[PDB]
From Swiss-Prot:
Coiled coil: none annotated. It holds the Pfam family GFP. Green fluorescent protein has been engineered to produce a vast number of variously colored mutants, fusion proteins, and biosensors. Further generation of mutants led to more stable proteins (at 37 degrees Celsius for example) with brighter fluorescence and longer fluorescence lifetimes. This is Green fluorescent protein. The gene is GFP. It comes from Aequorea victoria. One of its GO terms (biological process) is bioluminescence. SUPFAM superfamilies: GFP-like.
Length: 225
């Protein structure tokens, strides 16, 4: 495909986010690198407007699936890389069970040799005393399966999955994800058969960092075929 070649080695990544959650405005900048050969991602995010108004874990999914490792036999299903370098639009609605929801819109593409993910996030109907606004989520993350299906109508794909956030009391906060991706360019893209991505992430902190931030290590691999 088109983009495949662009992912052959380590690629620097830039993440920029503007969000408003219940009138709480904030910005995040993140930098790091991805290595699709191993489906590896290493990034550091910084809340540039000060203190993050929501819990970091809630933003992970929002904060570049083109870095997923696709096994040789599954390469023909790699829509993500296929849309590169022109990129794709990734839109979502994330429903927090018994709480508010997040609507996101992002553009992911190359700027020179940097892979850029620019996002706009709008959060509404959050409970002031909920797990989110209330900051009751543990600082960790689970493994999930992300289901992908082709959307021949939009020349894109539809993606759906549920994230499980651990709550400090031992309970769980569900976050239903609904996603659509469409190519930015006019060029041909790879439309896949149903399959899924298997994810794993580790959250950490930078001991020497005083700004509000998050350190993230993540591995993702395609499967189901």
């Amino acid at each position: 495909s088109k983009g495949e070649e662009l992912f052959t080695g380590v690629v620097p990544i830039l993440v920029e986010l503007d969000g408003d959650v219940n009138g709480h405005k904030f910005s995040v900048s993140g930098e790091g690198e991805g290595d699709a050969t191993y489906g590896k991602l290493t990034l550091k995010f910084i809340c540039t407007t000060g203190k993050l108004p929501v819990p970091w874990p809630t933003l992970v999914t929002t904060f570049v699936q083109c870095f997923s490792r696709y096994p040789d036999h599954m390469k023909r299903h790699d829509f993500f890389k296929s849309a590169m370098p022109e990129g794709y639009v990734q839109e979502r609605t994330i429903f927090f069970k018994d709480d508010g929801n997040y609507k996101t819109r992002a553009e992911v593409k190359f700027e020179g040799d940097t892979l850029v993910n620019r996002i706009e996030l709008k959060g509404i109907d959050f409970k002031e005393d909920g797990n989110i606004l209330g900051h009751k989520l543990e600082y960790n993350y689970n493994s999930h399966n992300v289901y992908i299906m082709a959307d021949k109508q939009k020349n894109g794909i539809k993606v759906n999955f549920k994230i499980r956030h651990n709550i400090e009391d031992g309970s769980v906060q569900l976050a239903d994800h609904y996603q659509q991706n469409t190519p930015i360019g006019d060029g041909p893209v790879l439309l896949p058969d149903n399959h899924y991505l298997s994810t794993q992430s580790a959250l950490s902190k930078d001991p020497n960092e005083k700004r509000d931030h998050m350190v993230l290590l993540e591995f993702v691999t395609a499967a189901g075929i």
